[PDB]
Amino acid sequence: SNFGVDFVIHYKVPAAERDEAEAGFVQLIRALTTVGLATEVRHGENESLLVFVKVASPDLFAKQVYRARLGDWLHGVRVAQALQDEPVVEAERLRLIYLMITKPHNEGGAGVTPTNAKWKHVESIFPLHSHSFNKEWIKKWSSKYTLEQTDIDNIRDKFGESVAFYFAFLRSYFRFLVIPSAFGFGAWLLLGQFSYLYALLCGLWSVVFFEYWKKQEVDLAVQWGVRGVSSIQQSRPEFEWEHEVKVYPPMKRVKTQLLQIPFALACVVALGALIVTCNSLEVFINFLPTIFLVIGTPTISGVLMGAAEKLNAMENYATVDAHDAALIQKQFVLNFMTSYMALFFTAFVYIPFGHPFLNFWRATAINPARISNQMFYFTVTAQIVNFATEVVVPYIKQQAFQKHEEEAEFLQRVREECTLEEYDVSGDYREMVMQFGYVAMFSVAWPLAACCFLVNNWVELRSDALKIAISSRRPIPWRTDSIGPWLTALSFLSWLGSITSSAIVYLCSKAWGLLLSILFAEHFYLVVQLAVRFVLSKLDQETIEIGRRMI
Amino acid sequence: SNFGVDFVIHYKVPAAERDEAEAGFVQLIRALTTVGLATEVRHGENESLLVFVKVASPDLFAKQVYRARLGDWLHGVRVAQALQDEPVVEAERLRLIYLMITKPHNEGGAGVTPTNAKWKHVESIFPLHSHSFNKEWIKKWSSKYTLEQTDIDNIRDKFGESVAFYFAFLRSYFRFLVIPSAFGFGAWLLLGQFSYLYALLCGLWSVVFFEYWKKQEVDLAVQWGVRGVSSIQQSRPEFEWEHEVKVYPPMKRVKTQLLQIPFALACVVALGALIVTCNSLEVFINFLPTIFLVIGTPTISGVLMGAAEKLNAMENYATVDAHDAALIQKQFVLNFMTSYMALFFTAFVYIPFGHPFLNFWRATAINPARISNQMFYFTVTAQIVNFATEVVVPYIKQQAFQKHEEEAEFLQRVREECTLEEYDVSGDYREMVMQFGYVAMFSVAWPLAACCFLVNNWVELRSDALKIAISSRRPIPWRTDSIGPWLTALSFLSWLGSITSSAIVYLCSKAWGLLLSILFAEHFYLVVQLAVRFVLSKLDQETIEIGRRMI
Ligand SMILES: [Ca+2]
Ligand SMILES: [Ca+2]
Ligand SMILES: [Ca+2]
Ligand SMILES: [Ca+2]
């Protein structure tokens, strides 16, 4: 197993800055020595000096643990000799050590942030995996049909909170996806296609699932003693300041943030042109559109994400949560557009009325079922893509790239692990949110399709684990209360689905009827939401003589 | 001034139960003597024995005050020697004395509840007014154009919390009513009648007023140290029990509460028949309808309120707040029906299409302006009624009914005051809520009418005070956090107004256009509410050598 190493620092050494590299190495060693953490130095591949750091003095660690617990007590998160009663878990120990490493000098730490400070040579600080535990976990989850709370608790203990919430949310989603599968099978087998009742049941299911997930999330947050952690604020190391606490004028912030609308219009035009020309080519040729979209989506998605990340970096945010919220909002907008605008133009444009490009295409040289059949590919193809780029090809690429002195195996393992990319949990949230959006606003067109989604989830709950198991390094533990801003996205998708399902039902099978159907669907959704929200709250002497003398 | 009397008990003595009356008198005297409160007995009119009770031992009162403060501290409401730092106010002293008088034996008091227990002879426990302070207050409020926070604070100190919230809410309503007056004057002078823009501004004003009132209510509640008082529960003395804490099966509760729908249908039919026959008589005769409605409204309102109160009494509620909420809900439903159904049938029935009663009326022997002109009377007449039954005629009736031994004036004052009816604050809330509903959902028909409402408020803020000043006895002080369930009624009225204003505008000046207008108005209202809610939230060694040896 591991040699007890608790953290590893890369500290690549450029050739042109040898004196600067030595000075930084000396400064880092001194800073790590003052805080009382034992360190060791070994060899490293590609002009790197891997250094291993672990805690040495138990008294200092216990004092830090007590101080952190008292600080949690002050802020209301939590309501020596107490360590035995409440044992230290690996996640909180790693979090405290990392915070001690990152915290600046003013707060008792030694700030070694790799970007803002003069420490321009360090690039990564990551822990080490437990191969035996990883193998045991993979074997255990591969022989169980359902997952109990013990497995989620073990994941929380060994990895933190964000991973635990992600897995709990995915498990709850898979558990409640069975009902839409049953209703879709029933509707497709008996009712047929474009059933209003199926749309109403889909809306009700979305509402009840969202409310129950909120309740279960609150329950889980209060169970683990983490509820209320989002109340406090964490200072972003990269947050610039211009005057004395650090202050930044809102004028620059709003001026930077108003730049988004140009980019939004530009991406709208860029995606719409491609969508309309693909549709024109398809209606002229009546395999090319599916292949073209499959090839084109990742190339444009990568550049869009890079541009969004750069734009968010240009903006200045005080706390980390605000920056993450902005990034998630931009990511959700871009992904929703690029994953739903094609279906929107195929449904609400092609069907109601069907030339300015058709004539040009002809000079170069209205089947209602188009919504259904295409959707088939638009699920299945996508599914296989989600099982092609995500899992097999990263491992193949890693293997191709891969293809004293008494512990060479450990050094080789560490060197291989260092080059691995850091895991981000936001992508899986995005994928699950888009799955829920598909189910909410488009399952009416193909009631059976929802069933297939269920199967995919039963793989994802394991497959993502494999992604953490091998194809990624151990993420830094963190504390969180909620999944994040994804609740707003889920609510918006549910409302949009309630609007869109009725319109799809009416159009696939004049104007005043459509308006009445939309109004009825929206009001029914609102009433059901109100009723479910109301119901779920209840689940949990002289005086005597004078009185006589009155007569 | 007063002789220091802190509470008065009536204790009427029926002739047929003289022995029982004497036994009850003795028991009450003993119970009041055990708790340590000094008592005195004097004469009383109409076979009554008025008894005056006041606190005697300062140590017991201070201990009770400290115990109550500690109990508040335990429940989170509040965050000897401390009494000097925080002086006792008259309201809290009266509340503590009344609680000591009412609390049963198990909790250290002497329960003298006049209804449930064997104490079947007592009927009232009321304090005494301060005539000099009342005159000074009336004179002060009659010479000021606007009211500062000091007057509201003084009212809170001298009367409690419910009166303070009522006056603050009425003042805020009067302050924000000026903007709709200005917009209505502008629309009537220039735009004309049935303006869509005026309806949109009315909706926006309603939304912003509701949100700002919620924020100001939270601020006021946290300012006076009362916020969170609604969290605790108060046991209702009349709550029956069937098994052992007291428990009551929900089966009886739901069986009793399902009886309401019969009554709702019965009152719907009863009011609708009268409304339709009055409308038929009016359209046949084209002064009788206005006079008939004015005479008929109080007679049917009284019996409806009596029936609702009896029905609520039949139901069993655990806590007092739930019973009050049910009573307010029934009162609001009945009053809204009886005050809006006439206008609803005049607007949404008479105009769109105009016999089954007309032919019968003929055998017995569509002007769009009807909405406007009638509304004139439907305001002004109502206003004069609100200034006829409320103020002048109660005083006239009281004067007509009205028309040792060294303090006969005090005894006469007490005897006159005892017969006065206890003040209820819910009626003024109901009236203000109905005024706001009129402004929200019908000001578009007559933009100028809102202006008149403003004037009425400038009288009510004083007139209601006069009602407390003379025509009523001092209410028992109480502690409350919010105005009550009236917030839900206000929100519902605002939403209904947003729906109704657009429909009125479209109808007074085909179907698909009406549906589109309704949809646009509702969505604009929702978007404005979301934006305002979002905005208002932001208002607030070896290691060195190895490194060198690497080269
Ligand atoms: Ca997948
Ligand atoms: Ca994934
Ligand atoms: Ca009045
Ligand atoms: Ca009044």
Side-chain angles (χ1 to χ4, degrees), chain A residues 422-444:
Chain A
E422 155 176 15
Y423 173 60
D424 290 331
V425 69
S426 63
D428 289 299
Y429 287 164
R430 187 188 43 200
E431 283 199 358
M432 291 325 88
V433 159
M434 302 319 205
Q435 296 290 322
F436 175 69
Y438 279 162
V439 171
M441 65 184 73
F442 282 124
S443 82
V444 54

PDB file of all heavy atoms in Angstrom, chain A residues 421-444, unseen atoms left out:
ATOM      1  N   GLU A 421      -5.229  14.010 -15.521  1.00  0.00           N
ATOM      2  CA  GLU A 421      -5.992  15.242 -15.386  1.00  0.00           C
ATOM      3  C   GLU A 421      -6.845  15.221 -14.121  1.00  0.00           C
ATOM      4  O   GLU A 421      -7.363  14.180 -13.708  1.00  0.00           O
ATOM      5  CB  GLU A 421      -6.882  15.454 -16.610  1.00  0.00           C
ATOM      6  N   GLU A 422      -6.989  16.393 -13.508  1.00  0.00           N
ATOM      7  CA  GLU A 422      -7.806  16.519 -12.309  1.00  0.00           C
ATOM      8  C   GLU A 422      -9.280  16.327 -12.645  1.00  0.00           C
ATOM      9  O   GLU A 422      -9.776  16.837 -13.652  1.00  0.00           O
ATOM     10  CB  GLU A 422      -7.585  17.884 -11.657  1.00  0.00           C
ATOM     11  CG  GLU A 422      -8.744  18.368 -10.800  1.00  0.00           C
ATOM     12  CD  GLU A 422      -8.448  19.681 -10.102  1.00  0.00           C
ATOM     13  OE1 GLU A 422      -7.475  20.358 -10.495  1.00  0.00           O
ATOM     14  OE2 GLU A 422      -9.188  20.037  -9.161  1.00  0.00           O
ATOM     15  N   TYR A 423      -9.979  15.586 -11.791  1.00  0.00           N
ATOM     16  CA  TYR A 423     -11.387  15.292 -12.016  1.00  0.00           C
ATOM     17  C   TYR A 423     -12.257  16.494 -11.673  1.00  0.00           C
ATOM     18  O   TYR A 423     -12.054  17.156 -10.652  1.00  0.00           O
ATOM     19  CB  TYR A 423     -11.816  14.086 -11.181  1.00  0.00           C
ATOM     20  CG  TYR A 423     -13.298  13.802 -11.223  1.00  0.00           C
ATOM     21  CD1 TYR A 423     -13.935  13.510 -12.420  1.00  0.00           C
ATOM     22  CD2 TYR A 423     -14.059  13.820 -10.065  1.00  0.00           C
ATOM     23  CE1 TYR A 423     -15.290  13.248 -12.462  1.00  0.00           C
ATOM     24  CE2 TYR A 423     -15.413  13.559 -10.095  1.00  0.00           C
ATOM     25  CZ  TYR A 423     -16.023  13.274 -11.295  1.00  0.00           C
ATOM     26  OH  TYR A 423     -17.373  13.013 -11.328  1.00  0.00           O
ATOM     27  N   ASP A 424     -13.229  16.770 -12.537  1.00  0.00           N
ATOM     28  CA  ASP A 424     -14.233  17.801 -12.309  1.00  0.00           C
ATOM     29  C   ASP A 424     -15.602  17.145 -12.249  1.00  0.00           C
ATOM     30  O   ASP A 424     -15.943  16.332 -13.113  1.00  0.00           O
ATOM     31  CB  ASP A 424     -14.206  18.867 -13.409  1.00  0.00           C
ATOM     32  CG  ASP A 424     -12.972  19.741 -13.345  1.00  0.00           C
ATOM     33  OD1 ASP A 424     -12.436  19.933 -12.234  1.00  0.00           O
ATOM     34  OD2 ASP A 424     -12.538  20.241 -14.404  1.00  0.00           O
ATOM     35  N   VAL A 425     -16.386  17.500 -11.227  1.00  0.00           N
ATOM     36  CA  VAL A 425     -17.685  16.873 -11.016  1.00  0.00           C
ATOM     37  C   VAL A 425     -18.805  17.589 -11.762  1.00  0.00           C
ATOM     38  O   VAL A 425     -19.906  17.034 -11.891  1.00  0.00           O
ATOM     39  CB  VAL A 425     -17.989  16.806  -9.505  1.00  0.00           C
ATOM     40  CG1 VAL A 425     -18.228  18.201  -8.948  1.00  0.00           C
ATOM     41  CG2 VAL A 425     -19.154  15.870  -9.207  1.00  0.00           C
ATOM     42  N   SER A 426     -18.554  18.790 -12.285  1.00  0.00           N
ATOM     43  CA  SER A 426     -19.621  19.555 -12.923  1.00  0.00           C
ATOM     44  C   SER A 426     -20.114  18.894 -14.206  1.00  0.00           C
ATOM     45  O   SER A 426     -21.292  19.036 -14.559  1.00  0.00           O
ATOM     46  CB  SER A 426     -19.146  20.977 -13.210  1.00  0.00           C
ATOM     47  OG  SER A 426     -18.069  20.977 -14.129  1.00  0.00           O
ATOM     48  N   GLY A 427     -19.240  18.176 -14.915  1.00  0.00           N
ATOM     49  CA  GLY A 427     -19.649  17.566 -16.171  1.00  0.00           C
ATOM     50  C   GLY A 427     -20.743  16.530 -15.998  1.00  0.00           C
ATOM     51  O   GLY A 427     -21.686  16.464 -16.794  1.00  0.00           O
ATOM     52  N   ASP A 428     -20.632  15.702 -14.960  1.00  0.00           N
ATOM     53  CA  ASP A 428     -21.654  14.691 -14.717  1.00  0.00           C
ATOM     54  C   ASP A 428     -22.979  15.327 -14.316  1.00  0.00           C
ATOM     55  O   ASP A 428     -24.049  14.852 -14.723  1.00  0.00           O
ATOM     56  CB  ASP A 428     -21.167  13.710 -13.656  1.00  0.00           C
ATOM     57  CG  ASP A 428     -20.059  12.812 -14.165  1.00  0.00           C
ATOM     58  OD1 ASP A 428     -20.302  12.055 -15.127  1.00  0.00           O
ATOM     59  OD2 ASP A 428     -18.943  12.866 -13.606  1.00  0.00           O
ATOM     60  N   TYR A 429     -22.933  16.399 -13.521  1.00  0.00           N
ATOM     61  CA  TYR A 429     -24.148  17.158 -13.247  1.00  0.00           C
ATOM     62  C   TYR A 429     -24.774  17.676 -14.531  1.00  0.00           C
ATOM     63  O   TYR A 429     -25.995  17.597 -14.707  1.00  0.00           O
ATOM     64  CB  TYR A 429     -23.859  18.322 -12.300  1.00  0.00           C
ATOM     65  CG  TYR A 429     -23.599  17.925 -10.873  1.00  0.00           C
ATOM     66  CD1 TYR A 429     -23.014  18.813  -9.981  1.00  0.00           C
ATOM     67  CD2 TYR A 429     -23.946  16.668 -10.411  1.00  0.00           C
ATOM     68  CE1 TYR A 429     -22.779  18.457  -8.673  1.00  0.00           C
ATOM     69  CE2 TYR A 429     -23.721  16.307  -9.104  1.00  0.00           C
ATOM     70  CZ  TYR A 429     -23.134  17.200  -8.240  1.00  0.00           C
ATOM     71  OH  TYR A 429     -22.903  16.838  -6.934  1.00  0.00           O
ATOM     72  N   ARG A 430     -23.959  18.214 -15.439  1.00  0.00           N
ATOM     73  CA  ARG A 430     -24.496  18.721 -16.697  1.00  0.00           C
ATOM     74  C   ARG A 430     -25.167  17.607 -17.492  1.00  0.00           C
ATOM     75  O   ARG A 430     -26.274  17.781 -18.019  1.00  0.00           O
ATOM     76  CB  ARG A 430     -23.382  19.376 -17.512  1.00  0.00           C
ATOM     77  CG  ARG A 430     -23.863  20.078 -18.766  1.00  0.00           C
ATOM     78  CD  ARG A 430     -22.693  20.538 -19.611  1.00  0.00           C
ATOM     79  NE  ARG A 430     -21.657  19.516 -19.695  1.00  0.00           N
ATOM     80  CZ  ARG A 430     -20.397  19.753 -20.035  1.00  0.00           C
ATOM     81  NH1 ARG A 430     -19.982  20.969 -20.341  1.00  0.00           N
ATOM     82  NH2 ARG A 430     -19.533  18.743 -20.069  1.00  0.00           N
ATOM     83  N   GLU A 431     -24.514  16.447 -17.577  1.00  0.00           N
ATOM     84  CA  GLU A 431     -25.084  15.341 -18.343  1.00  0.00           C
ATOM     85  C   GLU A 431     -26.400  14.859 -17.738  1.00  0.00           C
ATOM     86  O   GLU A 431     -27.379  14.634 -18.463  1.00  0.00           O
ATOM     87  CB  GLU A 431     -24.082  14.193 -18.438  1.00  0.00           C
ATOM     88  CG  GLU A 431     -22.976  14.428 -19.450  1.00  0.00           C
ATOM     89  CD  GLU A 431     -22.279  13.146 -19.860  1.00  0.00           C
ATOM     90  OE1 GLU A 431     -22.637  12.075 -19.325  1.00  0.00           O
ATOM     91  OE2 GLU A 431     -21.373  13.210 -20.716  1.00  0.00           O
ATOM     92  N   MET A 432     -26.448  14.700 -16.414  1.00  0.00           N
ATOM     93  CA  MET A 432     -27.688  14.263 -15.776  1.00  0.00           C
ATOM     94  C   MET A 432     -28.793  15.300 -15.936  1.00  0.00           C
ATOM     95  O   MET A 432     -29.963  14.947 -16.131  1.00  0.00           O
ATOM     96  CB  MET A 432     -27.449  13.956 -14.298  1.00  0.00           C
ATOM     97  CG  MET A 432     -26.593  12.722 -13.985  1.00  0.00           C
ATOM     98  SD  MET A 432     -26.743  11.293 -15.088  1.00  0.00           S
ATOM     99  CE  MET A 432     -25.536  11.632 -16.368  1.00  0.00           C
ATOM    100  N   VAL A 433     -28.443  16.585 -15.856  1.00  0.00           N
ATOM    101  CA  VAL A 433     -29.438  17.634 -16.044  1.00  0.00           C
ATOM    102  C   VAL A 433     -30.010  17.576 -17.453  1.00  0.00           C
ATOM    103  O   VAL A 433     -31.220  17.734 -17.653  1.00  0.00           O
ATOM    104  CB  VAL A 433     -28.826  19.011 -15.727  1.00  0.00           C
ATOM    105  CG1 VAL A 433     -29.633  20.120 -16.375  1.00  0.00           C
ATOM    106  CG2 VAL A 433     -28.757  19.216 -14.227  1.00  0.00           C
ATOM    107  N   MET A 434     -29.158  17.336 -18.452  1.00  0.00           N
ATOM    108  CA  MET A 434     -29.665  17.250 -19.820  1.00  0.00           C
ATOM    109  C   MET A 434     -30.521  16.004 -20.025  1.00  0.00           C
ATOM    110  O   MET A 434     -31.510  16.042 -20.767  1.00  0.00           O
ATOM    111  CB  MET A 434     -28.510  17.295 -20.817  1.00  0.00           C
ATOM    112  CG  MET A 434     -27.685  18.551 -20.672  1.00  0.00           C
ATOM    113  SD  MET A 434     -28.758  19.973 -20.412  1.00  0.00           S
ATOM    114  CE  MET A 434     -27.728  21.293 -21.025  1.00  0.00           C
ATOM    115  N   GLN A 435     -30.165  14.892 -19.375  1.00  0.00           N
ATOM    116  CA  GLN A 435     -31.030  13.714 -19.422  1.00  0.00           C
ATOM    117  C   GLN A 435     -32.405  14.023 -18.843  1.00  0.00           C
ATOM    118  O   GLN A 435     -33.438  13.670 -19.433  1.00  0.00           O
ATOM    119  CB  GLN A 435     -30.390  12.555 -18.661  1.00  0.00           C
ATOM    120  CG  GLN A 435     -29.088  12.055 -19.248  1.00  0.00           C
ATOM    121  CD  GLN A 435     -29.290  11.347 -20.562  1.00  0.00           C
ATOM    122  OE1 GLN A 435     -30.272  10.633 -20.743  1.00  0.00           O
ATOM    123  NE2 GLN A 435     -28.360  11.536 -21.490  1.00  0.00           N
ATOM    124  N   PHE A 436     -32.434  14.690 -17.688  1.00  0.00           N
ATOM    125  CA  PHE A 436     -33.708  15.045 -17.075  1.00  0.00           C
ATOM    126  C   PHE A 436     -34.493  16.000 -17.963  1.00  0.00           C
ATOM    127  O   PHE A 436     -35.722  15.910 -18.047  1.00  0.00           O
ATOM    128  CB  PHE A 436     -33.487  15.660 -15.696  1.00  0.00           C
ATOM    129  CG  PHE A 436     -34.746  16.157 -15.053  1.00  0.00           C
ATOM    130  CD1 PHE A 436     -35.716  15.268 -14.631  1.00  0.00           C
ATOM    131  CD2 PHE A 436     -34.963  17.508 -14.876  1.00  0.00           C
ATOM    132  CE1 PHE A 436     -36.875  15.718 -14.042  1.00  0.00           C
ATOM    133  CE2 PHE A 436     -36.121  17.965 -14.287  1.00  0.00           C
ATOM    134  CZ  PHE A 436     -37.079  17.068 -13.869  1.00  0.00           C
ATOM    135  N   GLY A 437     -33.803  16.925 -18.628  1.00  0.00           N
ATOM    136  CA  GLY A 437     -34.488  17.831 -19.536  1.00  0.00           C
ATOM    137  C   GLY A 437     -35.118  17.107 -20.710  1.00  0.00           C
ATOM    138  O   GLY A 437     -36.256  17.394 -21.096  1.00  0.00           O
ATOM    139  N   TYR A 438     -34.380  16.164 -21.302  1.00  0.00           N
ATOM    140  CA  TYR A 438     -34.948  15.352 -22.375  1.00  0.00           C
ATOM    141  C   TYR A 438     -36.203  14.639 -21.900  1.00  0.00           C
ATOM    142  O   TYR A 438     -37.250  14.695 -22.556  1.00  0.00           O
ATOM    143  CB  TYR A 438     -33.925  14.333 -22.878  1.00  0.00           C
ATOM    144  CG  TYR A 438     -32.909  14.883 -23.847  1.00  0.00           C
ATOM    145  CD1 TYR A 438     -31.724  14.208 -24.091  1.00  0.00           C
ATOM    146  CD2 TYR A 438     -33.134  16.075 -24.515  1.00  0.00           C
ATOM    147  CE1 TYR A 438     -30.789  14.705 -24.972  1.00  0.00           C
ATOM    148  CE2 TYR A 438     -32.204  16.581 -25.397  1.00  0.00           C
ATOM    149  CZ  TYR A 438     -31.034  15.891 -25.622  1.00  0.00           C
ATOM    150  OH  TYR A 438     -30.102  16.390 -26.500  1.00  0.00           O
ATOM    151  N   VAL A 439     -36.122  13.983 -20.739  1.00  0.00           N
ATOM    152  CA  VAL A 439     -37.275  13.250 -20.224  1.00  0.00           C
ATOM    153  C   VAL A 439     -38.444  14.194 -19.971  1.00  0.00           C
ATOM    154  O   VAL A 439     -39.605  13.855 -20.230  1.00  0.00           O
ATOM    155  CB  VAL A 439     -36.891  12.474 -18.951  1.00  0.00           C
ATOM    156  CG1 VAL A 439     -38.126  11.901 -18.282  1.00  0.00           C
ATOM    157  CG2 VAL A 439     -35.912  11.370 -19.286  1.00  0.00           C
ATOM    158  N   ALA A 440     -38.160  15.395 -19.467  1.00  0.00           N
ATOM    159  CA  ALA A 440     -39.231  16.300 -19.069  1.00  0.00           C
ATOM    160  C   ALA A 440     -39.945  16.900 -20.274  1.00  0.00           C
ATOM    161  O   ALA A 440     -41.179  16.949 -20.307  1.00  0.00           O
ATOM    162  CB  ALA A 440     -38.673  17.405 -18.173  1.00  0.00           C
ATOM    163  N   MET A 441     -39.196  17.368 -21.272  1.00  0.00           N
ATOM    164  CA  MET A 441     -39.803  18.150 -22.342  1.00  0.00           C
ATOM    165  C   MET A 441     -39.919  17.417 -23.671  1.00  0.00           C
ATOM    166  O   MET A 441     -40.437  18.000 -24.628  1.00  0.00           O
ATOM    167  CB  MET A 441     -39.041  19.462 -22.561  1.00  0.00           C
ATOM    168  CG  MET A 441     -37.621  19.322 -23.047  1.00  0.00           C
ATOM    169  SD  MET A 441     -36.813  20.927 -23.161  1.00  0.00           S
ATOM    170  CE  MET A 441     -36.560  21.298 -21.431  1.00  0.00           C
ATOM    171  N   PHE A 442     -39.461  16.171 -23.778  1.00  0.00           N
ATOM    172  CA  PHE A 442     -39.562  15.489 -25.059  1.00  0.00           C
ATOM    173  C   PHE A 442     -39.924  14.015 -24.967  1.00  0.00           C
ATOM    174  O   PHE A 442     -39.970  13.350 -26.006  1.00  0.00           O
ATOM    175  CB  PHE A 442     -38.251  15.645 -25.839  1.00  0.00           C
ATOM    176  CG  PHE A 442     -38.101  16.981 -26.500  1.00  0.00           C
ATOM    177  CD1 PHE A 442     -36.998  17.774 -26.248  1.00  0.00           C
ATOM    178  CD2 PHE A 442     -39.069  17.449 -27.368  1.00  0.00           C
ATOM    179  CE1 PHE A 442     -36.859  19.006 -26.852  1.00  0.00           C
ATOM    180  CE2 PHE A 442     -38.937  18.680 -27.975  1.00  0.00           C
ATOM    181  CZ  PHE A 442     -37.830  19.458 -27.717  1.00  0.00           C
ATOM    182  N   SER A 443     -40.191  13.479 -23.776  1.00  0.00           N
ATOM    183  CA  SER A 443     -40.569  12.074 -23.680  1.00  0.00           C
ATOM    184  C   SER A 443     -41.940  11.804 -24.279  1.00  0.00           C
ATOM    185  O   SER A 443     -42.256  10.646 -24.569  1.00  0.00           O
ATOM    186  CB  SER A 443     -40.543  11.612 -22.224  1.00  0.00           C
ATOM    187  OG  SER A 443     -41.743  11.966 -21.559  1.00  0.00           O
ATOM    188  N   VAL A 444     -42.760  12.839 -24.469  1.00  0.00           N
ATOM    189  CA  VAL A 444     -44.097  12.633 -25.017  1.00  0.00           C
ATOM    190  C   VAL A 444     -44.021  12.164 -26.464  1.00  0.00           C
ATOM    191  O   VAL A 444     -44.834  11.346 -26.908  1.00  0.00           O
ATOM    192  CB  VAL A 444     -44.935  13.916 -24.875  1.00  0.00           C
ATOM    193  CG1 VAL A 444     -44.213  15.099 -25.496  1.00  0.00           C
ATOM    194  CG2 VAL A 444     -46.300  13.727 -25.502  1.00  0.00           C
TER     195      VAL A 444
END
